[PDB]
């Protein structure tokens, strides 16, 4: 059923587009200045804040880049937003940029300070997918969460308590948790945890176990290809009418869109452009914990590890100066594409028979199997 699912999500994409365009028209930005992932970000956050303000806005004058610090009527923003979505709320839409931010953060940063202070092993990176993602996120917002993500929550919810309505949360938070697991025991053991009203160290210690079980017997976690507002704004402006032509977040749609995107980014004096593009690209598909081998395979070019990556973050801090600042064009194109999955595999070869698709292969017709016998460069982005 390609009617609701493909076209209803198109309608949520149209909203973000339309809105971004309107909002650019207010700031009186240029074309080059609307394609600046920097400005796009600021706008996206202005909105999520207002639906739950001001921000950094970079301008282009003869030669150099000027940063403007601006503020907007928190309600005006909310007004312009609905205008774009037909006076609807389109929580999906806000939630979408809620993820784009997530997926960018799960790749720009490593959240160790928090894992340990919770009592999780820092080496449990690959399980913290969406730890940044506000609880306000929707139902299809939590499905993107890693097993480890859930644990850090319950453990804190439990840790402060064990140190009214709060109960329905805990059970559900576990049901979700449990719905991540895809094996008998895994599934059953989650229940043995959900049994205690005041679950103390008994649970505290047990879930941590299950956290580690997922390192081997992974769960089902959905991945959503969520592109920056500018990319959708630009697309909408170019005529693409997604609600009518359909769109996906786990199909070929997102890759294809990024095959024509003209996104620019601010880049510090000593930073490596190629390295910058890589980052953004990995946030566009939630590939921050993917096997570097495969990421590079599909990417088309080396996908260098975080340590060897030359960049500190895409957003520009108030500390820095503009004099020594310039901007590059982000390389977001990829070689092939792949069905962003949810499954963690089980039996060691996973996704037996599943392959990669050419960017011409619109339909999921002919699959391609990668052979990794090769001089690779690692598997752990972190």
């Amino acid at each position: 059923n390609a009617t609701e699912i493909r076209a209803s999500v198109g309608k949520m994409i149209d909203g973000i587009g339309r809105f971004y365009i309107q909002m650019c028209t207010e700031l009186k930005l240029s074309d080059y200045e609307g394609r600046l992932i920097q400005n796009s970000l600021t706008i996206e956050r202005m909105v999520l804040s207002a639906f739950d303000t001001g921000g950094p806005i970079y301008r282009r004058v003869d030669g150099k880049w000027r940063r403007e610090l601006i503020l907007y009527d928190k309600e005006e923003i909310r007004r312009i937003w609905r205008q774009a979505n037909n006076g609807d709320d389109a929580t999906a839409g806000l939630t979408h940029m809620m993820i784009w931010h997530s997926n960018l953060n799960d790749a720009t940063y490593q959240r160790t300070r928090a894992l340990v202070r919770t009592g999780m092993d820092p080496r449990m990176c690959s399980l913290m997918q969406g730890s940044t993602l506000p609880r306000r996120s929707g139902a299809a917002g939590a499905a993107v969460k890693g097993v480890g993500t859930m644990v850090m929550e319950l453990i804190r919810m439990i840790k402060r308590g064990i140190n009214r309505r709060t109960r329905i949360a805990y059970e559900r938070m576990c049901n979700i948790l449990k719905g991540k697991f895809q094996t008998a025991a895994q599934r059953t053991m989650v229940d043995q945890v959900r049994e205690s009203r005041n679950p103390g160290n008994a649970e505290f210690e047990d879930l941590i176990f299950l956290a580690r079980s997922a390192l081997i017997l992974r769960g089902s976690v959905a991945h959503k290809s969520c592109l920056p507002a500018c990319v959708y704004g630009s697309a909408v402006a170019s005529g693409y009418d997604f609600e009518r032509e359909g769109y996906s977040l786990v199909g070929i749609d997102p890759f294809r869109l990024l095959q024509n995107s003209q996104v620019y980014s601010l880049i510090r004096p000593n930073e490596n452009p190629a390295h910058k593009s890589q980052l953004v690209w990995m946030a566009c598909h939630s590939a921050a914990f993917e096997d570097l081998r495969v990421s590079s395979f599909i990417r088309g070019t080396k996908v260098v590890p975080r340590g060897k990556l030359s960049t500190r973050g895409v957003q520009i801090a108030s500390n820095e100066n503009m004099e020594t600042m310039e901007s590059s064009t982000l390389e977001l194109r990829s070689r092939y594409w792949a069905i962003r999955t949810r499954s963690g595999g089980n039996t060691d070869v996973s996704f037996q028979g599943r392959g990669v698709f050419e960017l011409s292969d619109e339909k999921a017709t002919s699959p391609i199997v990668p052979s990794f016998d090769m001089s690779n460069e690692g598997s752990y982005f972190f």
């Binding site: 449990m124 914990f289 069905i339 595999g345 599943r354």
Partner: peptide, 19 residues
Amino acid sequence: SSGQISIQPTFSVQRNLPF
């Protein structure tokens, strides 16, 4: 250490999953 130990899979392909 302080590094990764397993790979979270993002795509559907024939891939030995590292841990």
